[model samples]
Structure formats: C-alpha cells, structure tokens
Target chain A: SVLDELYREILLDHYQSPRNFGVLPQATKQAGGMNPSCGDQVEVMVLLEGDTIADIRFQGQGCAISTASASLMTEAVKGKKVAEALELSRKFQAMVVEGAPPDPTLGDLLALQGVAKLPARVKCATLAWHALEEALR
Target chain B: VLDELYREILLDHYQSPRNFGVLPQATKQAGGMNPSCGDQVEVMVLLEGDTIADIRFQGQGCAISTASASLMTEAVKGKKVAEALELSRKFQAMVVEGAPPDPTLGDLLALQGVAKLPARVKCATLAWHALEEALR
Candidate 1:
C-alpha cells in the first residue's frame, strides 16, 4: 500500500528529521497551535520579505502527522508568495477536511492525504497548516 | 500462534476486560476524556491503607482505551499506591514517548504498538491518566 510505504517514510524521516525546525529568531510573525484532544501543540514562525516568505520554522510537541505536516509545510511554502502559500493552505484543507482530490501542488504533504479517510486523524494533520495561516497573516 | 495469543490477550481484555465492574466501596475516583473523539473513562479505586485493594473502570472508549484500562486494573491491583502510581508514570512514558515497557508492566506490554500511533496515544493513556488522578 502506498500508505504503508508513505507512512513509514514520513513517520521515520520527516517526523524524526523535520526540516526547518526551531525558533526563527528573526521571525516577524509567529503563531501557536494545539489540539487539546490529542495533546498536540506547535509554534510556526515566518519571516516575510516584501510579499514573499523568506524563511519558516517551527517547534513543538505533537504527533508524527502534525510534526511532519509542519516540516513539509515549511519545505513547500518557503520562498513562495504569501498569497500562493495561503492558496496551498486552502487546497490542503479541502483535501484533508473536505476529502477533495489530491493536488500535486502540495508536494510531500500528499503523504497526509490518507488523513482524509480517517476522521480521527484530520486534526492531527492540519494543526500546523492552520498555524501557518495564522503566522502568515 | 501470535494470533491465538493476541486474540486471547489483547482482544480478550478489550472484549471482556478483567477487573471490569462497579466498585461500590470506592474511596477514590477520577474521570478523563479524549475531547477529540469524546471517549471517556472513570477509574475508581478502593484504597486499603496504601495499597490499591480493588480497581475498576467504566466508560465509553475505543479498543485501546478499554484494553489499557483492563490491563492497568489487573496490574495495579493488590499493589501499593506508590508502586501503582509509579507504574502509571512508566506506562505514559512507554506509550507516549516510545520508551521500552518495564518488566513490571506485565500484560500491559501489549501496548508496544500504541507508541507508534500518534493519534491513539491519548486513547491508550486516558484511563491511566485518571488512575493517577484518583491515587494522587
């Protein structure tokens, strides 16, 4: 199953070696996020230069899905226009929460597409994207 | 063979939990909820001096939550309050942090896979969390 191979890779790699993880001391915007039900929490920090995101970072305690989602979010959106990143956020929410079709535009985040089929896992996967939307605003 | 034991051990505890019933003489009780799914459990304890004389739990939850409660009740019963609470601490570490389960956890060892399930970790620990509340 793509999900098993996908699950193992993301659970071991993105979760274990999350990209752009830590405090962004130069961040101009930061947002805190949590899912009280599952005890997941994360912080997203962004440095917006003009209309573009210059850098992004996050640190927190959460499940593998949230952690990997945040890690993948940073990789996908860095250097893109704030508008484009938010566009991706809407797409991500549609796919995960609304069970919309997969968008190749989301990159590694597609690993979380499986979340759409599992109602219990939706919040865990989206906690970070929601935080990113707040950080970008 | 693995299926036979798992069906006997894990599935059995979930299906017909051991130590499952109302403790009419309870001296301590605590309730917990996984607000995510609204699954809840109330752990009741009959404390005899410093030992947990009797333990029972009743609630609505997933298989992991029910099974953990059953396994925990069995392991902590007839044990000192300090020892049982210590077990709770270790259980959380094992399930939430992927730590190796201690020998003292006994049949509770069935939870080794719960650590990998990021979303279900709370489900597995809700009862134990309430247990600490009742004891502490």
Candidate 2:
C-alpha cells in the first residue's frame, strides 16, 4: 500500500515530466543543496522584491524524487511573500515526512507525501527545499 | 511497480531461502563480499564425481544478494561442474550486460530484469562469482 502510493502514477508523471525546471537569470537569491549518497543536487534562485517573492526558478540533476520535488517547488512559491514561502517549506517538509494524504490545497506538493516510506529517498525529495532555504537565508 | 516487484522477490528469498546455509562436506567452497553494498555470501558445493552432488549457501546481505544467491544455488545443483560453470557464465553475461543466453536454458534467463537495475548487479552476482572462483 505504501509502496504503491509512494511510486504513484502522479509522482512518476511529475518525475518524468517536471515543470519549472530551469535556472533564473540574474536572480536576487541563489543557493544549492546536495544529497551525497545518491548524488541528488538542486540549485534554487529566488527574486524577492522587498518581502514578496517576485519570481523563483530552479535547476538540478538528481533522481526522480529530487528533480520532481524541485520542479513542483518552483511553481508553489512563485507568488508568495518571503515568510509565506518559508511556511510553505515547513508545510512541505511535514507532508513529505508525515505521509499526510494528498492536500490539493497545498498545490502539486501533496504528491511528495509518498516519499515518507522511502527513508533513503527522503533526502532526494527534500533537496529542493534545502536549496530554497539556503537561498532565502 | 519496480519497488514492489523488487521488495517481493528480495523479501521472499531473505526470509525463507530454499537452499540457505552451507553444506558441511562440500567439495567446493566459495566466499565473496560486495564492497559496494557490503553484501557477502559463501557457497558450498558437493560434487558427486564430476557433477555437483549438492549445493548450499550462507550469507549476510540485502534483498538482491540473498535472493539471487538462493535462486543460483537452486539452479546449479544436479548439473555437472562444467555445466554449472557454463550456466554461471551465461547467467553472469545475461545479468551484467543484458545479453540473451542460449534459448533452451530459460530458468537462468529470468535474471534479465535484474540487469536493468545497475545497483543490484553486484548483489545478484555475488554467489555465482564466488562459485566460479572457488571451482577454479
């Protein structure tokens, strides 16, 4: 049950066809994160004007989990303020770890809940979040 | 689907291996360990004249290692040493490079799915390679 849910059609769909998957040019904040175990890495760039995140972009090469997670992350945080974006990160972390059922309210991020059962892959799914945090900091 | 398929096969072999542990009076004994994944296996082979009289194995490892070893032990026994070695070569060729073996030997050919999984290759081959080295 958990395995089926983790490797669901939706996750594989995003993994195979990721969105928002390129770098932003001359962005205000840029940072990267890596999972040394599987060589999963991501770089995120956020353009924040005052406290509002004006735009966000990301790029990376990694496993299905990490790459898809990064792709979904870019779309989720594009229009949020700095604090709201940080809250999104916290919520995302909870969803990935807690196996919370899909919450379409959180946008496409609900797909990451499947990662909870794959302990080794959790880092792969979280690489984008960590990179985003680094960029925001 | 891949994870579930892998988990089923691996967990089955890990829990109730058909030919686990070693044969006390084995004519050939082989030991091998995969440095990459830290999977280890020891194969004990008994020869009835030049044929493999019986075969058994003992090992500590993950799902791929233990399951593949169990399947290998079951396939090789009751065949001549040369035949066993040849089958090992064929199986290795099949699993390592995704090559097709002689059409008649279908049982060993089942490992082709494993070759697609690069990380599990070493785990699948541990016992077979050890058998070859021990026989030589």
Candidate 3:
C-alpha cells in the first residue's frame, strides 16, 4: 500500500526524468561526494549571486530515490537565499531521516517523506542535500 | 510496467546462469533451505589470498533463488571476502527491508522490487545466506 503510493506518486516521474540535472557552468560553488561505504554519488553546482542562490543543478548515479531526491532538491533550492535553502535542507532531512512532519513550504518534495521508514535509504535521499549543505557553507 | 520488464531480466538469469555448477577448486561451501517456498541452494567459493578467485552455485529452486545465486556469484568473484559479506548484507537489507541498494550492485538492483514480495524474500536470500555461511 505504502509502496504503491510511493511509486505512483510524483516520486516515480521525477525519478524517471529528473529536473535541474547536469553541470552549472556559471556555478560559483561546487561540492560532491562518493565515500567508500556510500556507493551513491552526487555533484552539486551552485551559482550563488551574492547571498541569493541564482541557480543550482546536480549530476550523479545511484538508485531512483537518490537521483529523484537530487532532482527535487534542485527545484526546491533554486532561486532561494542561501540561508533559506540551507534551512530547508535541515527541515527536509528532519522529515526524511527523523520522520518529522514537513513544513507546508516543503511542497511537492514532501513525497520523499516515506523514505524515513527506510533507515539505509535515508542517506540515499539525503546525499544531494548534504552536498547542498557543503556548497552553501 | 518496470517490474514486468525487470521480471524478464530475472527470467533471463534463471534460464542462463553464468555461475552455475560447482567450483572444482572450491575451498569453502555451504547450503540453505527456505521452508516457506521449499527453496534449496548451495554456494561454493575458491578464496584466494582473501579474495574470491572463483565462486559458483548448484541446486534446484525457484526462479528468484536461482537468479539471486547467479547474480551473487558474479558480484562476489574478484572481491575480497569482506566485500562479499558486505554485499550480502546490503542484498538482505534491500530485499527484505526495501533499503536502497549499494551502487556497486548495478543490474543486481533489479531485485530491489523483491522487497514487496514477502514470501519471496527468503527465496531470494537463500543463496546469499548460504554464501555467508561458507565465508564464515
């Protein structure tokens, strides 16, 4: 039942065809990771015009959830203030990793809240966000 | 739609296993049975300098069991024993708990959907559990 909702929801379409994918040539800040224990990898490129996030994009290989999370992340964080996007990342991780109810502003990205039930997958959904954390900081 | 196509991928492995049969020089071996589905399978390995120089499986079982062993054998060979064990752990988590699989699994990740099939989890892990036993 939960799996059906998870698959049939926005998660699948975003996974099948992600948004804001690829490199950002205008990027002023970039970060990525591929640790030994984490087979999932991601590269986050941020075009920060002053304190505002002018644009953002990601590139990576991993599971549907990992890629899809990155896809949703770029959309959620783009056009926001660096501080706002970082704050959003905190709420998003809290929702996905700690099962807290997401803020109303989380919008469609809330679809990934189901990931909280999967302990190992938390890292999958959060990989891109952590990079966002790095690039913004 | 994706599962249907992935099932075809599973069927392909069931019909033509690359690592079927015993490893003639197997230094370690073990087997397991899943009473739920009556699935039985065994694994044998040629551990060389802490790496799996060769690995194979033999037995009669369901499509899931045979395909799992087939895929596991391929992933573990050329890997150190610790790597193989870690793979087995991730495989169990993915199949049983719907955990996201390690990127190293690649095509073997087709089994991620098996988590939805409760009875089949045992069938899928049969060879992998036996693999763990042999490694220990």
Candidate 2 scores an fnat of 0.00
List of chain A TM-scores, every candidate: 0.91, 0.84, 0.90
The residue pairs found clashing in candidate 1 are none
**Model 2: per-residue lDDT, tens digit, B39-116?**
998888888788888989887888777778876776677778898887788788888886764433333344567889
**Best model number under lDDT:** 3
Candidate 2: segments with Cα more than 4 A from true spot: A1-7, A98-105, B1-136
Question: What's the lDDT for all of these models?
Answer: 0.80, 0.74, 0.81
Q: Estimate each model's TM-score.
A: 0.53, 0.50, 0.55
Error of 3 at B47 (Å): 24
TM-score of chain B only, all predictions?
A: 0.91, 0.84, 0.92
What is the TM-score of candidate 2? 0.50
Native interface contact recovery, all models: 0.00, 0.00, 0.11
Superior candidate under lDDT, 2 versus 3: 3
- Cα lDDT tens digits, model 3, A23-135, are 99868999996633446789999998898999889986665667778999999889999899988999999998888888778887887877887776688889899998988
Ranking by DockQ: 3, 1, 2
Give the higher-TM-score candidate: 1 or 2: 1
Q: Which residue pairs in candidate 3 collide?
A: none
